[PDB]
Write a protein that binds this ligand. Structure first.
Ligand code: FMN
Ligand code: FMN
Ligand code: ATP
Ligand code: ATP
Ligand code: MG
Ligand code: MG
Ligand code: MG
Ligand code: MG
Lengths: 350, 350
């Protein structure tokens, strides 16, 4: 069997009658599918366990994911190879804890509430990739470090210190958060992983054989930022939000790095500084995207590559050749140093 | 009144008789102190709520913190100004959920277990400072960004890429984690906050008026690393673990920075790059610690300052004067570039 456990938040106020009505329908349908489980609610949070044959469970879960009456859905546990039903008598038992007043329940309710509030806050400070691992039955704190080949992505905002000195603090933070949201959505869609924010820079990585997807993410980010600049409100600082991107490939160490108070599951190795140094080169070029020959040679599609005969990196073992993509964007960009001048003059007047 | 809620982990296996024995004693003592509450256990995790007069609660809690039968104690909620008792009949009610088999309890137990396992894992990926705020009744996700004066601390491991290429991956990670633990313990003891790990670098900050404490942390870190080098086992890579430290002071923005998938409560501003650039200068000097004139001039004790007439920073508005502390360590260090040579030759033979 399969057994799923998830929690979610009310999308809107729901009465006890409305909740009982959801239970009735759930029971009617689960009974037909030979599915059992329990549904609990407390102070605007749903908890549910559902168990049955795998295909049927996936179908039910897809409908539940589409239900507009809850949101912020998070699967806490996905058990496959289940051997015995936990609630064999219950097609769907509904337990509204708001309305319960039993003796021993009362202290458990309070503990359940306090832990849930805490857990839903921590979710926002922790990586989604960590939760997936937990829900698959693995404790990520016990994963051993390993050497692995990756593509490292590094981006940073051009002349950001100008923002921080000409605008109110709420507006500065609003710009960086918009930049970080744009990058995360695209990188995640292309199969990559944002692993660290560093001031105004984004560090992310892709599998060692995904150069195509890292290149595609980079071009889509740059295109998304152009669209944002041209459609921003009059006087918006987003009109002068520009980025540079660098990509490198190499063997890195992946694992739990940190102290006893706080760790991250992240990567370590020379490819990280190489991507950082490449990203910094975009400040002296019209190209907003540069990447190493190792990335270029690992790609499998016929990209419009251009070889930049200006490889003047530092801290490189034996120097590396540098490439970019030649597209309309790059040919119609006025150069990194002139853009920093343009940012100052514009923000000095908003 | 005051009401405390905490969770903890069994330090060792405990029988149901042993647990009931803890309850008996708790009841006897809480009754004398006019304290009430509840104690629950499940699968080796304690949960407790205790409520009463504030001074008495603090005293009870200090004894509980010293009890060697549980560990990993975390306060989830500290309520002051409480108006009504939650458990007025219960000096200390003990509820052993392992032994419970009531109808409606069973599903709640399962949900409580799953959330607790998840919560105790996320704790290790999130900053302790976040939990303190939550336990005081504030949701940190709703704190507004603010401009504030801070001391920024930046440290990094000398010639780390040599470690990563000469040693097995488990040993590389073990070294960086030891470095990060040494720094965190000292910085936290001096009232500072480690906010980010970046590859092999530590970023931390202190209040704007705590230059003395940031300087003291820096000297204690360097002294702790020397002691570690000289007492490491024969052939240990820790014998060639060296660090550089840079400190700067300025106005930064503090708040929630990130995307919708993941944010950090951290800082942003020019003082961060200034401390980074200062830290990098230690690679060309015998000094392992350098800091800006703003830090020097903000300190209130009579430190053995030395003015370094070599201020050749880049990206600085109008250049800055650079200082260090002249002590035995610095005068008996053979210089940054010779140390990187020494690290390679030693690790090439372990
Ligand atoms: C908290 C919550 C839990 C739900 N649990 C179930 C369930 O266990 N089984 C089910 O078939 N539908 C469940 N639903 C409802 C489905 O989302 C969907 O409305 C229903 O399956 C559609 O049935 P219908 O096509 O007959 O109207 C749940 C909805 C909510 C908000
Ligand atoms: C989970 C756990 C919960 C406890 N709760 C209480 C409590 O509520 N009140 C109390 O006085 N001692 C409590 N204790 C025990 C104290 O740690 C300590 O042993 C006791 O107060 C000492 O009493 P004594 O000096 O009479 O031996 C608890 C211990 C554990 C492991
Ligand atoms: N610009 C960067 N941004 C983020 N992480 C970086 C950056 N540069 C390096 N790292 C990380 O730090 C690790 C160590 O690189 P670093 O630049 O500190 O070199 P090093 O060999 O330690 O020499 P140094 O003596 O200059 O500190 C790298 O493996 C990478 O994981
Ligand atoms: N070495 C660094 N390590 C960590 N964070 C840094 C570092 N340098 C800068 N930052 C953070 O990034 C923010 C932006 O600094 P950055 O170096 O990107 O300057 P900038 O004005 O954006 O110019 P550029 O066009 O060179 O990117 C700084 O305010 C600081 O918060
Ligand atoms: Mg920048
Ligand atoms: Mg930057
Ligand atoms: Mg280093
Ligand atoms: Mg480094």
């Amino acid at each position: 069997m399969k057994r799923l456990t998830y929690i979610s938040k009310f999308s809107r106020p729901l009465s006890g009658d409305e909740i009982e009505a959801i239970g009735r329908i759930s029971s009617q349908k689960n009974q037909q599918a030979n599915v059992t489980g329990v549904l609990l609610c407390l102070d605007g949070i749903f908890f549910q366990i559902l168990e049955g044959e795998a295909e049927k469970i996936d179908r039910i879960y897809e409908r539940i994911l589409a239900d507009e009456r809850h949101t912020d859905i998070l699967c806490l546990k996905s058990e496959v190879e289940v051997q015995e039903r936990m609630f064999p008598d219950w097609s769907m038992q509904t337990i509204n804890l708001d309305e319960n007043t039993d003796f021993l329940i009362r202290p458990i309710k309070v503990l359940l509430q306090t832990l849930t509030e805490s857990h839903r806050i921590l979710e926002k400070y922790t990586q989604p990739s960590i939760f997936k691992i937990i829900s698959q039955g693995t404790n990520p704190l016990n994963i051993r470090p390993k050497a692995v080949e990756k593509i490292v992505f590094f981006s940073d905002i051009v002349s950001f210190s100008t923002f921080a000195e000409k605008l109110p603090v709420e507006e500065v933070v609003s710009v960086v958060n918009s930049y970080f949201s744009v990058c995360t959505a695209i990188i995640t869609r292309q199969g990559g992983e944002v692993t660290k924010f560093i001031g105004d820079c984004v560090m992310a990585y892709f599998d060692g054989d995904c150069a195509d997807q890292a290149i595609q993410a980079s071009l889509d980010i740059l295109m998304e930022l152009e669209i944002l600049r041209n459609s921003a409100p009059e006087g918006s600082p987003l009109r002068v939000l520009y980025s540079g991107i660098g990509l490198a490939k190499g063997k890195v160490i992946e694992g739990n790095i940190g102290s006893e108070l706080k760790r991250d599951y992240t990567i370590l190795g020379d490819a990280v500084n190489v991507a950082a140094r490449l990203e910094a080169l975009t400040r002296q070029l019209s190209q907003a995207l540069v990447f190493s020959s190792e990335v270029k040679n690992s790609a499998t599609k016929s990209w419009n590559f251009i070889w930049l005969t200006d490889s003047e990196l530092k801290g490189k073992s034996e120097s590396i050749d540098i490439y970019s993509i030649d597209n309309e964007m790059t040919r119609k960009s006025s150069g990194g140093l002139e853009i920093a001048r343009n940012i100052g003059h514009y923000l000095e007047r908003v």
